[PDB]
Write a protein that holds these residues in place. Structure first.
Motif, PDB file in Angstrom:
ATOM      1  N   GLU A  50       6.854   2.988  -9.802  1.00  0.00           N
ATOM      2  CA  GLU A  50       6.301   3.177  -8.432  1.00  0.00           C
ATOM      3  C   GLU A  50       4.779   2.984  -8.456  1.00  0.00           C
ATOM      4  OE1 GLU A  50       7.636   6.706  -6.266  1.00  0.00           O
ATOM      5  OE2 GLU A  50       5.731   6.768  -5.168  1.00  0.00           O
TER       6      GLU A  50
ATOM      7  N   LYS B 248       2.365  -0.342  -6.910  1.00  0.00           N
ATOM      8  CA  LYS B 248       1.326  -0.245  -5.848  1.00  0.00           C
ATOM      9  C   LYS B 248      -0.065  -0.535  -6.432  1.00  0.00           C
ATOM     10  CE  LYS B 248       0.377   4.778  -5.770  1.00  0.00           C
ATOM     11  NZ  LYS B 248       0.731   6.056  -5.109  1.00  0.00           N
TER      12      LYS B 248
ATOM     13  N   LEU C   5      -3.067  -2.739  -6.623  1.00  0.00           N
ATOM     14  CA  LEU C   5      -3.643  -3.682  -5.627  1.00  0.00           C
ATOM     15  C   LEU C   5      -4.264  -4.878  -6.358  1.00  0.00           C
ATOM     16  CD1 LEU C   5      -4.319  -4.303  -2.692  1.00  0.00           C
ATOM     17  CD2 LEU C   5      -6.400  -2.947  -2.952  1.00  0.00           C
ATOM     18  N   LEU C   6      -3.643  -6.056  -6.239  1.00  0.00           N
ATOM     19  CA  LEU C   6      -4.117  -7.323  -6.858  1.00  0.00           C
ATOM     20  C   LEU C   6      -5.275  -7.891  -6.029  1.00  0.00           C
ATOM     21  CD1 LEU C   6      -0.631  -8.862  -7.730  1.00  0.00           C
ATOM     22  CD2 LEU C   6      -2.258  -7.802  -9.306  1.00  0.00           C
ATOM     23  N   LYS C   7      -5.100  -7.986  -4.707  1.00  0.00           N
ATOM     24  CA  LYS C   7      -6.149  -8.459  -3.763  1.00  0.00           C
ATOM     25  C   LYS C   7      -5.798  -8.030  -2.332  1.00  0.00           C
ATOM     26  CE  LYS C   7      -5.265 -13.186  -2.042  1.00  0.00           C
ATOM     27  NZ  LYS C   7      -5.717 -14.568  -2.323  1.00  0.00           N
ATOM     28  N   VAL C   8      -6.814  -7.965  -1.465  1.00  0.00           N
ATOM     29  CA  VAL C   8      -6.679  -7.769   0.010  1.00  0.00           C
ATOM     30  C   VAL C   8      -6.984  -9.112   0.683  1.00  0.00           C
ATOM     31  CG1 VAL C   8      -7.328  -6.309   1.981  1.00  0.00           C
ATOM     32  CG2 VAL C   8      -7.539  -5.408  -0.342  1.00  0.00           C
TER      33      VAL C   8
ATOM     34  N   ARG D  46      -2.455  -6.296   2.269  1.00  0.00           N
ATOM     35  CA  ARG D  46      -2.588  -5.964   0.824  1.00  0.00           C
ATOM     36  C   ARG D  46      -1.485  -6.665   0.022  1.00  0.00           C
ATOM     37  NH1 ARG D  46      -1.363  -1.822   2.803  1.00  0.00           N
ATOM     38  NH2 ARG D  46      -2.703  -1.520   4.628  1.00  0.00           N
TER      39      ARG D  46
ATOM     40  N   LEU E 114       0.274  -6.197  -3.355  1.00  0.00           N
ATOM     41  CA  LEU E 114       0.568  -5.250  -4.465  1.00  0.00           C
ATOM     42  C   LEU E 114       1.287  -6.013  -5.585  1.00  0.00           C
ATOM     43  CD1 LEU E 114       1.820  -2.258  -2.265  1.00  0.00           C
ATOM     44  CD2 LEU E 114      -0.519  -2.848  -2.917  1.00  0.00           C
TER      45      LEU E 114
ATOM     46  N   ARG F  35       4.123  -5.327  -6.993  1.00  0.00           N
ATOM     47  CA  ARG F  35       5.586  -5.344  -6.712  1.00  0.00           C
ATOM     48  C   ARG F  35       5.932  -6.504  -5.766  1.00  0.00           C
ATOM     49  NH1 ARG F  35       4.555  -0.036  -3.485  1.00  0.00           N
ATOM     50  NH2 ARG F  35       4.715  -0.709  -1.307  1.00  0.00           N
TER      51      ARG F  35
END
Lengths: 48, 156, 48
Positions: free
Chosen positions: A3, A7, A9-12, A18, A20, A22
């Motif tokens: 979990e 989550k 965060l690779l990039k926005v 976002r 993620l 996953r």
């Protein structure tokens, strides 16, 4: 846990959406390698 | 503080009901706070000591006491999944929409750890579902980020 | 026995939104508050 890794965060994106980890990968708790598989009298087993 | 104030902080944390009982009879300061600003009710709520939470509230403990970072016992109880204590605190007039220094509420913390029963109890006592933290995040924004599809449905 | 400790969470989204690297954040916090052993110098013919 999977979990918490999910989550990450690779990039926005430019619009604020976002990406993620996953979203770009399946995340499970699995073996370091999948080479060695053992059986005892036909049934699932490990050992030393 | 005082000598008995320290023993109550220790007893409340440890979960020693008998020692808390004797300290309440002897008049141990229920508003006694450590260096970080944690009352005996803060500690009892954190470690999940239900009887001591009830005994402290009977002996005029501040239900909406906050630490040096603005967090209340309801924040602690809701975060660490203590359902019975959350109900008791809310019945004794705990601020359901209490904001810490970060703008975080008991609903945010409950949503973050996926405490579904507690989230419903907070909403039952009028938890502001649209309440945002310092990063403009709601309890619903946490559920979709955490991937808790059960929780996300409750918060609509 | 367990003691009260100051938990701080870095918001990954806000860091990426402001263009602030997590290495710079964790180095700044770690070096300032914790102290950082950078490298060695020679004091009167002794490495220190």
């Amino acid at each position: 846990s999977t979990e918490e890794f999910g989550k990450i965060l690779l990039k926005v994106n430019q619009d604020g959406s976002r990406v993620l980890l996953r979203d770009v990968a399946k995340i499970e708790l699995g073996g370091e390698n999948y080479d060695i598989i053992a059986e005892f009298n036909g049934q699932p087993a490990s050992g030393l | 503080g005082s000598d008995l104030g320290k023993k109550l902080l220790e007893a409340a944390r440890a979960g020693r009901d008998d020692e808390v009982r004797i300290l309440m009879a002897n008049g141990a300061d229920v508003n006694a706070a450590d260096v970080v600003g944690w009352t005996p009710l803060h500690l009892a709520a954190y470690w999940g000591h239900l009887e001591i939470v009830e005994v402290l509230l009977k002996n005029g403990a501040d239900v909406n006491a906050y630490d040096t970072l603005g967090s209340t016992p309801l924040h602690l109880a809701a975060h660490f999944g203590h359902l019975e204590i959350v109900e008791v605190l809310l019945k004794n007039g705990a601020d359901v929409n209490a904001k810490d220094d970060n703008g975080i509420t008991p609903l945010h913390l409950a949503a973050n750890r996926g405490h579904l029963e507690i989230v419903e109890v907070l909403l039952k006592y009028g938890a502001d579902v649209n309440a945002q933290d310092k990063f403009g995040k709601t309890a619903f924004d946490i559920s979709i980020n955490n991937g808790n599809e059960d929780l996300a449905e409750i918060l609509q | 026995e367990d003691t009260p400790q100051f938990k701080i969470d870095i918001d990954q989204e806000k860091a990426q939104a402001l263009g602030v690297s997590i290495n710079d954040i964790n180095t700044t916090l770690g070096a300032a508050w914790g102290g950082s052993y950078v490298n060695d110098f020679i004091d009167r013919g002794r490495v220190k």
